[PDB]
Nucleic acid binder design. Sequence first.
RNA 1: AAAUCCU
Length: 453
Amino acid sequence: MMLKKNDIVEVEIVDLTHEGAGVAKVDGLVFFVENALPSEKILMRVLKVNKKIGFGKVEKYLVQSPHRNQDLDLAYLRSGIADLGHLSYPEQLKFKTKQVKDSLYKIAGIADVEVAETLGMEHPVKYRNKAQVPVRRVNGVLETGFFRKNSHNLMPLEDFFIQDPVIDQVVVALRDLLRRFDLKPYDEKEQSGLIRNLVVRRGHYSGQIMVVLVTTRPKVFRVDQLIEQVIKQFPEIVSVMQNINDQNTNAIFGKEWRTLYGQDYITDQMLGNDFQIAGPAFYQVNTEMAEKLYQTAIDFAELKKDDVIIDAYSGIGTIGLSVAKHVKEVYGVELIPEAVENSQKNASLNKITNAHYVCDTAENAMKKWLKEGIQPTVILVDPPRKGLTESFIKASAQTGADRIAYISCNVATMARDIKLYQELGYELKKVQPVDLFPQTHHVQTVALLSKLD
RNA sequence: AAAUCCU
Ligand SMILES: Nc1ncnc2c1ncn2[C@@H]1O[C@H](CSCC[C@H](N)C(=O)O)[C@@H](O)[C@H]1O
């Protein structure tokens, strides 16, 4: 047969993609059906027929999965912020464990290495310490909410499910004040309006709140009066920042940062020590599981008093300063000035005078450290989704480091980079996934690579 | 490809 647009066909889902979309096969075409779990009988409406693949919609459910979550509140967030909410939490952990095993095989050619089960939350809800929230006009009303997948169409929402309840109350309180003061929301198509987004970071243990008003222009009309109101409702707001982003882009922040009130940072704890976090600086969104993520990497590293650690992709120096008292030297690198400046202050704040940072790209610092004659025994790395470059992997091999711990939020690039480490004499010993992002497709992973000879 | 969604 020859399928085409708006044809209803009975199919069976036999797999999930890494992003969470159901996979079905009909006449040599791999169809990707949204909101469809494995072993489900459905009438699939064909959306777009392609050369080798296809795309579909569930027109009717004939048989649903035993592992389906019927929660109506999570179903609203499926095409968006909680794209594995419709799968039950035990199976999310099995799914993410499978993704690490499948990716290490398909990319790296590895089938005989320990990938233990994913360490999940006891209560997998209300976890995010940061929350980026766009502001838009919906039916002539200023609304805070979330975009649907593959769009900038704002779905208004108050209860975010996966975010801190206090952050939800702050963004709802900010929404009301933007309505009250009559500040115009940013229209993306028209290129009109002031208030683009709202970023609200809140410490997991401390509870100290930052607010960032992302805007098109520098001038915000009656902002000091608007700031004065949120302090009465939420005294824990130690800082209110302003970011200016005049360009038309999917990216949130522009260049110019300003301090409208109080500090230019919040303070929050991880493990024993305290850490100052700036607005543009990175902070692990799930502090509870990030502590378990670090403690896995720290135990995997098998640290000694005479070890020399490299914490590449430092951020605010959470991993490095957590182990600096238990080792001889700690060397870190971080591209963003605001993050590495926190990192230096965090070392001083916790009486750590052996944490030596540099502001550069990771590959550049490794070339310098290799040239100037540093002798690192352990290499801890925690890059973004894109992962490591070939320069860094080759340079880090030439240092003659005993162990390398790879923390990642994208197994695809991790499996690619591990494949190159195997070519330069580093065997992959252990792997341990940790669920930093419940109710979503994203998988955090730690991986001990140990050297031969 | 840049951060939970944010083509
Ligand atoms: N080429 C590069 N070299 C070094 N750092 C980079 C980089 N590209 C991005 N980064 C930075 O690396 C950081 C990754 S997140 C840092 C994780 C941190 N150690 C923690 O666990 O808290 C970000 O702050 C990002 O700005």
